[PDB]
Ligand binder design. Structure first.
Ligand code: CU
Ligand code: CU
Ligand code: MN
Ligand code: MN
Lengths: 159, 157
């Protein structure tokens, strides 16, 4: 298979925020996510620090401990589903991802067609990640929760 | 203004070094020991080596680790334990804790010779996953391990 890019990457809040999908991915530990066999894609959010990141992250670093909720909407059929992307690592580094049933999902019309994808992104403090705030070593305040929107054509499992 | 603690160790795809500095102020509040009660901020600096076996790019910070510490004054025999928590400073993410040394109510943690031990477990403990497919998959995580350092604590900076 391979990666299919979703929309255009956004630069916001000190971060580059890109979306891609792949074929379904076998994940460990088991039960952590939807089984590959029961899915049609693996959806990934690629989020890294820009230059001059205001929260202390070096350019290029992965942004860890983010809470990323998603909404995937087939605008042709109206079908909507939601979930969360979980942190994980592949051979090219860490990302946030989830296996998702598309055609396999008979509870809605999640077939090939036109989609809107939304990420709802909350800062690392929501998961207990800390920041220095002293004059000598501190960094700027975190972003408030925000959303990014992409549009793409889902053409089926990459093969 | 960081004070090196012992010698860095390279293992399980990671460079693991320790440093201390002056106490820092962390948000959210009520978790890390307040700056004014502490004498040092202890940090573990943990980054991927080349060809990291779990797919982390060389130099990336190693996230989602569980890290406990033990600090022993070998002169007085005082021992304390705690946790190092993930956080970010102007020099990037690390695992750290404010620690009372001279200011520890129990005494025994002043200037002297110390042994520091980190007890580290892998990210799966915190729900972090890994691809295991043929094309993009990566190997198993290390089992829980410890690393040990010796240093002289010369006083609160
Ligand atoms: Cu993934
Ligand atoms: Cu710190
Ligand atoms: Mn990715
Ligand atoms: Mn440091």
């Amino acid at each position: 298979g391979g990666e299919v890019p979703i929309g255009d990457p956004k630069e916001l809040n000190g971060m580059e925020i890109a979306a891609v999908y792949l074929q379904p991915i076998e994940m460990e530990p088991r039960g952590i996510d939807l089984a590959a066999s029961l899915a049609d894609i693996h959806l990934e959010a690629d989020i890294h620090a820009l230059k001059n990141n205001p929260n202390g992250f070096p350019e290029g670093f992965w942004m860890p401990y983010l809470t990323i909720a998603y909404e995937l909407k087939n605008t042709d059929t109206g079908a909507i589903k939601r979930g969360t992307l979980m942190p994980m690592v592949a051979d090219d580094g860490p990302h946030y991802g989830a296996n998702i049933a598309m055609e396999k999902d008979k509870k809605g019309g999640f077939g090939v067609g036109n989609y809107e994808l939304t990420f709802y992104i909350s800062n690392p403090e929501k998961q207990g990640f800390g920041r220095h705030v002293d004059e000598e070593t501190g960094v700027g305040k975190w972003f408030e929760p925000f959303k990014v929107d992409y549009k793409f054509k889902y053409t089926g499992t990459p093969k």
